[PDB]
Symmetry: D4
Subunit: 121 residues, 8 copies
């Protein structure tokens, strides 16, 4: 099964970061979420109830990215993946990518970050 | 076999959507279509008859994206995949991606959507 | 005097629009603000008090773009220009540009909108 | 008066061109339209009747770009400018820009084209 | 072995096409070439003789894209793949992608095209 | 008179440069050309003879950018402006912009260059 | 005289900022420099001595952007403009633009900043 | 395990190259680094000590890209991969991509380069 649902380039202003100054000032975090879901029934019925609603998905992502400040990107991505899988049975697997296009790194790069893939149990 | 034929970034203005206001106003839908096809004969002969004509492919995609208004993206992608496979034997498999870069989602993201891969029977 | 202060590409999700469906669903509004201000003293002193603070400027723009829903872009731009000039004497003139990259217009365009220039009285 | 209304990046597939092969095949034409209009009343009242409706403007542009095939870009831009000024008194002046990003020119360039500014009489 | 050598976004103005008008006028063709090659020796020695020279590769691609006019993209990609493999033993496999961002297709899309992967015999 | 004709982003691979190594290796030069021309007659008649043909213009630019290697950008832009004005009476003024996006400058910048405006005598 | 010399998109990682946390962490500053200079002699002679060398210009900009940490953008732009005019007589006027694409501003915008134009005395 | 850590679009100005003129003048090298690392513990603990610090990673990449001049890209990528794996046990595998967007290649392409994947021993 290679069907997916996606939310690309979501961006949030949060105060996460290991450096005290990071949590003080804050920055923009870019998030990509890809969910493994079978979409043939929904594609057959045309009934939004036979699939996963993204607006809802976006609400989960948001509430986490714009919530309490944490240290690592790995913690935010793990809270999002775990949160999405717990609420939706149809999501067979969840992939979370978080990019920090402007970390406290003296240099020229397009962005830094992490990505994780969490299968639904 | 890893050969493909592609039509990237096709965009259509349709009135699909689960929200009544969506079907009223309308929006732009971006579509990516990748077809699995063996192109060595055509690459050998140089005869357009030994391959799949995209302009035709685009016509199928268009007629569906700019046709009657439906509820889900999964329905549009399933009508396109099913329609392409039924008309072309050379297409061993069809992948359809539809992006809604501006859904009724209060936030900042690059786009939301779905993707499906339908092997030809 | 050709010095300016600028805030480019600010984007807000608001429910402004003349069509009822527009106010229902909402969309993203992109805003560009250019202020006429003499920056030689501040450039000489290096004292933020001798110039106009943008973060503050952004707060004014935001509070208007993300406030009550209105009909026209001309009303939002006029509320922003009038609001910026009333609060800052150093701003000799204010230019406001608002773009609706996705209005209820069946077609392919990069965006539509208005721009106004309001000298400070 | 430096207020304006704009429609940027409109794109149409038309068959205009001096070369017979151009009119046969066709291409995409990108159009930018900037109208000189006083928007303080509309910005004051918030009444769409006190300003120029772009969707209407876009309809005029479209009907010309997607109408009969002509030879020059100068003819299309002159038909659009003349057409916009004749229908709207509030438009003090109209600027039309048409770009042919893919003319029959053997080379590497981003695009070619013309621009005209037509004051309303 | 997942090492590769690449030449991305090469663009050529050629007169290939099935439509007579296409061969008359011409257009820009974008080409992506990815070659499978083991680069540890060259990465170890730092000797350009232990690897595949791209400038040479580009010369082969060019001479084909800017040579006699043919009908299909599949023919150009097959002439390039076959030509690269015949001249270089180190290339274990060659992938050719050709995009026609402006074919004679009445519509709005980012580009159309084909891709092929040819293992070296 | 604010009408213009334009050729944007033309790019050529030439060996111009003050540094011997520059003339040896070569680089890509990006060129923008804006010509002042009255386009109302041509816009009225639709006759390409009542205006300035760009393809021709591009040929002049090309023959200079891809010709003998010189030292300065100012020399190339002056040869182009002077060449365009001498051949076309309708061009009331010519503006030439040449960008070196990759000069021998150790740093991170989008590009360097010059621009000149030459009225036709 | 409308000739200019330009350096666009220069970017530097500096620790300037009014907020202590800003000077601690640092960020990327984007700089645009446009110099008013008559380039007809240099365009006539082709002698780099009859014009202003940008690499040198870039060195001045750099040494200031990557030097001691200051409070305002207005101070950096004033040090650059003043520094360029003092060293080059041919520069009739200097324009400096500095953008902070990621200031400590909780929001979504493309960038904030200032611009100044300093005529040479 | 499909988790990764990434640093995309890092760019450095180095003097590497097989052509003497290349080492003389220099150019910008773009680097992409993807590291295979298990991020569930760190995602669970939120402790930066349970993962690989990128700023450190960037320092290794930098010191190599901005160090002594070498001949091939394969040598730089092999020094980076080997250097990252030797210093971090958590990195199960390292992928290095280096692009030369402006090599001494007379043509129009987006960039050329190599990529390697080095599993950690
Ligand atoms: C905030 N933050 C992170 O999340 C992080 N994750 C890794 N792997 N390294 C990190 N650093 C340095 C950091 O500052
Ligand atoms: C129109 N529309 C869809 O097609 C859709 N598909 C999914 N999975 N969720 C959807 N929502 C919320 C929607 O409004
Ligand atoms: C919401 N809205 C506007 O603000 C507007 N301003 C002009 N000039 N025309 C407009 N239309 C059609 C609209 O729907
Ligand atoms: C279609 N077409 C034009 O409109 C045009 N306008 C100018 N000035 N030159 C032109 N050429 C060559 C052309 O083919
Ligand atoms: C020039 N040309 C092609 O190469 C081609 N290849 C496929 N598969 N279809 C094609 N058409 C319609 C075309 O015009
Ligand atoms: C090739 N080249 C130029 O054309 C040039 N023009 C100015 N003003 N400065 C220049 N330098 C340094 C250069 O190398
Ligand atoms: C660092 N910094 C500035 O340079 C600045 N310049 C203006 N006008 N406002 C500014 N703020 C808020 C700031 O933090
Ligand atoms: C500097 N340099 C390289 O690193 C390289 N690597 C390959 N495979 N070919 C190369 N050429 C031509 C070059 O000039």
């Amino acid at each position: 099964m290679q069907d997916t649902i996606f939310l690309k380039g979501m961006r949030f202003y949060g105060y996460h970061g290991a450096l005290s100054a990071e949590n003080e000032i804050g920055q923009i975090f870019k998030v990509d979420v890809t969910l493994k879901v079978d979409l043939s029934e929904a594609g057959r019925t045309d009934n939004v109830i036979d699939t996963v609603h993204y607006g809802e998905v976006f609400e989960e992502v948001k509430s986490i990215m714009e919530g309490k400040a944490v240290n690592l990107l790995e913690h935010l991505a793990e809270r999002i993946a775990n949160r999405i899988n717990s609420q939706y049975n149809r999501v067979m697997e969840t992939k979370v990518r978080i990019t920090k296009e402007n970390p406290p790194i003296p240099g020229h790069y397009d962005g830094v970050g992490i990505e994780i893939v969490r299968e639904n149990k």
